[PDB]
């Protein structure tokens, strides 16, 4: 069923809450035993959001290999993503260790450091060229190279140095700064423009490790980003684009991380973004 007609059907009948609860009921449940070990309690932002054991990213250290991060591997679309929580005061060094070890080119941030008067993640990158950051627990140095501030997003060029080997790499930071404190955006136009800027940079392409994407919990806004990207790519690849079923793609992604898409409003917004984005994919 053409999702656009499915969309109007759900909208006229006002059944978004019912659709979303069906997804929650059918979603996978896999163990997350490592996330729940007592030694890891200060590595998790939220008690109820954990990576599954089978898909979690492992840090390359014998001490404690745990980080709240999951590998979403989309086999038909030939795309992979790492979805993670906003870094905590005690995990900023782990976060950059993961970016280094997984050979990522880009980091996608969908939240502000402070929202609703409260801290939603650590200030984990440097704000001035001449004031670099050193992460002593993981032996990394991070320097701000340049910053481009636009009306709906900011793009930063960063230099990450492995102090053990003195190798350096360029990391691109894509920061969507205008998601509202409550609800979802009224129009998907600026979110789609942002997605296309990330694509154009190479950060989503197979010559690099997976993009790292996060918000505060790494499931809601972050889930919207990867769901929209994968659905638009599948519409490009298939003979019949109307065969792409967004609910089925979402359930596939929930095999790899729990809770993706947190509200019925986020589900509706994801539909809107794919419907409007397809009016470029099919040619427009």
UniProtKB/Swiss-Prot annotation:
Q: Which residues carry this modification: Cysteine persulfide?
A: 215
Q: Give residues where S-nitrosocysteine occurs.
A: 215
Q: Which Gene Ontology terms describe the biological processes this protein takes part in? A: actin cytoskeleton organization; cellular response to angiotensin; cellular response to fibroblast growth factor stimulus; cellular response to hypoxia; cellular response to nerve growth factor stimulus; cellular response to nitric oxide; cellular response to platelet-derived growth factor stimulus; cellular response to unfolded protein
At which residues is Phosphoserine found? Answer: 50, 242-243
Q: Which residues carry this modification: Cysteine sulfenic acid (-SOH)?
A: 215
Principal location listed in the UniProt entry: endoplasmic reticulum
Provide the positions where the record notes the PTM N-acetylmethionine: 1
User: In this chain, where does the modification Cysteine sulfinic acid (-SO2H) occur?
Assistant: 215
| Superkingdom of source | Eukaryota
Q: Does the keyword Aminoacyl-tRNA synthetase apply?
A: no
Q: What class of enzyme is it?
A: hydrolase
Name the catalytic site residues.
Answer: 215
Known post-translational modifications? Oxidized on Cys-215; the Cys-SOH formed in response to redox signaling reacts with the alpha-amido of the following residue to form a sulfenamide cross-link, triggering a conformational change that inhibits substrate binding and activity. The active site can be restored by reduction. Ser-50 is the major site of phosphorylation as compared to Ser-242 and Ser-243. Activated by phosphorylation at Ser-50.
Q: What's the catalysed reaction?
A: O-phospho-L-tyrosyl-[protein] + H2O = L-tyrosyl-[protein] + phosphate
Which EC numbers does the record give?
Answer: 3.1.3.48
State the protein's purpose: Tyrosine-protein phosphatase which acts as a regulator of endoplasmic reticulum unfolded protein response. Mediates dephosphorylation of EIF2AK3/PERK; inactivating the protein kinase activity of EIF2AK3/PERK. May play an important role in CKII- and p60c-src-induced signal transduction cascades. May regulate the EFNA5-EPHA3 signaling pathway which modulates cell reorganization and cell-cell repulsion. May also regulate the hepatocyte growth factor receptor signaling pathway through dephosphorylation of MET.
Q: What is this protein called?
A: Tyrosine-protein phosphatase non-receptor type 1
Underlying gene: PTPN1
Shown stretch of the complete protein: 1 to 284 of 435
């Amino acid at each position: 069923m053409e999702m656009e007609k499915e969309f109007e059907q759900i909208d006229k009948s006002g059944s978004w809450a019912a659709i979303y609860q069906d997804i929650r009921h059918e979603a996978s449940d896999f163990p997350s035993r490592v996330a729940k070990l007592p030694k890891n309690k200060n590595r998790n932002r939220y008690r109820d959001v954990s990576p599954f054991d089978h898909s979690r990213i492992k840090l390359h250290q014998e001490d404690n290999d745990y980080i709240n991060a999951s590998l979403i591997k989309m086999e038909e679309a030939q795309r992979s993503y790492i979805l993670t929580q906003g870094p905590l005061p005690n995990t900023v060094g782990h976060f950059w260790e993961m970016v280094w070890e997984q050979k990522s080119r880009g980091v996608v941030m969908l939240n502000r450091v402070m929202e609703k008067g409260s801290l939603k993640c650590a200030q984990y990158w440097p704000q001035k060229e001449e004031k670099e950051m050193i992460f002593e627990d993981t032996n990394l140095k991070l320097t701000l190279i340049s910053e481009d501030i636009k009306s709906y997003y900011t793009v930063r060029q960063l230099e990450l140095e492995n102090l053990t080997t003195q190798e350096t790499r360029e990391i691109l930071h894509f920061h969507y700064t205008t998601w509202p404190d409550f609800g979802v955006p009224e129009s998907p136009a600026s979110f789609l423009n942002f997605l296309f800027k990330v694509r154009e940079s190479g950060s989503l392409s197979p010559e690099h490790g997976p993009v790292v994407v996060h918000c505060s919990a790494g499931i809601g806004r972050s889930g919207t980003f990867c769901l929209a990207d994968t659905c638009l790519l599948l519409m490009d690849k298939r003979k019949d684009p109307s065969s792409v079923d967004i609910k089925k793609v979402l359930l596939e992604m929930r095999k790899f991380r729990m809770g993706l898409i947190q509200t019925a409003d986020q589900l509706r917004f994801s539909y809107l973004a794919v419907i409007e984005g397809a009016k470029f994919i099919m040619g427009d």
